[PDB]
């Protein structure tokens, strides 16, 4: 690793701190805000390296979306108020780690137009393919999914499934599966076959509910795919607010 990349696991490449066009086939320039290893059961069994990125041009939105006004209004009737001597950053941090407040804060963040990107780098290819198959079931444990249009959810997961069909044939260690969350919550999916030094553009998931559900899962305070990646993301967001 260089000062321009960070180590996630010795079995796979260091993650760039910044990624954008033209070097990478992305919509805008992204900055790494959290990383970690997605394990299955134990740290003994590493499935993939996870990197969460924010659009450089959108970092300003965090403080405007997750401001003290929204914190106060969201929970003014539900929870005791935050202590007035605390900083806003301290108050926001406590809410983002509170199981009862975090989903609401994250949903509001994910509706604000902020562009995010996940870098999903396989460590064990077989496990990764299985985690792909299980993605719909996983993100739908989210209770907020039930209120939504079932037909739109099903159609959106077919879009994702089709993109995943193309990924699964390629999966190998140290390849990069990229998922960009556009400002309208549709998703551009791409794939870097590292050994060929080739980019594959997989397509777009138009249904915005799918990107909302997937990135709410990445950033979930309870049972996120990578607890260590989520913690880093939250610290990045608090420090921006
Ligand atoms: O295909 C992916 O990387 C998403 C799956 C996921 O969120 C996980 O189970 O870790």
Residue numbers in the entry: 70 to 310
Original authors' sentences:
Saccharomyces cerevisiae possesses two predicted CHI-like proteins, Aim18p (encoded by YHR198C) and Aim46p (YHR199C), but it lacks other enzymes of the flavonoid pathway, suggesting that Aim18p and Aim46p employ the CHI fold for distinct purposes. Here, we demonstrate using proteinase K protection assays, sodium carbonate extractions, and crystallography that Aim18p and Aim46p reside on the mitochondrial inner membrane and adopt CHI folds, but they lack select active site residues and possess an extra fungal-specific loop. Consistent with these differences, Aim18p and Aim46p lack CHI activity and also the fatty acid–binding capabilities of other CHI-like proteins, but instead bind heme. We further show that diverse fungal homologs also bind heme and that Aim18p and Aim46p possess structural homology to a bacterial hemoprotein.
Full-length constructs of Aim18p and Aim46p possessing N-terminal 8X-His tags were insoluble, but truncating the N-terminal mitochondrial targeting sequence and transmembrane domain for Aim18p and Aim46p (Aim18p-Nd70 and Aim46p-Nd62, respectively) dramatically increased solubility. Additionally, the structure of Aim46p-Nd62-WT contained a small molecule resembling α-ketoglutarate in the active site (Document S2), but we were unable to confirm its identity via mass spectrometry. Despite multiple attempts, we were unable to generate heme-bound crystal structures for either Aim18p or Aim46p. Alignments of the Aim18-Nd70-R123A and Aim46-Nd62-WT structures with the bacterial protein revealed that, while the α-helices differed substantially, the core CHI antiparallel β-sheet was structurally homologous to the core antiparallel β-sheet of cytochrome c'β-Met. Of note is a region of the Aim18p-Nd70 and Aim46-Nd62 structures that lies in between plant CHI α1 and α2. This region contains an extra loop that is absent in plant CHI domain–containing proteins but is conserved across multiple ascomycete Aim18p and Aim46p homologs. Nearly all of the CHI catalytic residues are substituted nonconservatively in Aim18p and Aim46p except for the catalytic arginine, which is invariably conserved in fungal homologs of Aim18p and Aim46p. A single nonconservative mutation in these residues is sufficient to nearly abolish catalytic activity, so the presence of several substitutions suggests that Aim18p and Aim46p likely lack canonical CHI enzymatic activity. Upon treatment with sodium carbonate, Aim18p was liberated into the soluble fraction, while a significant proportion of Aim46p remained in the insoluble fraction, suggesting that Aim46p′s transmembrane domain might be more strongly associated with the IMM.
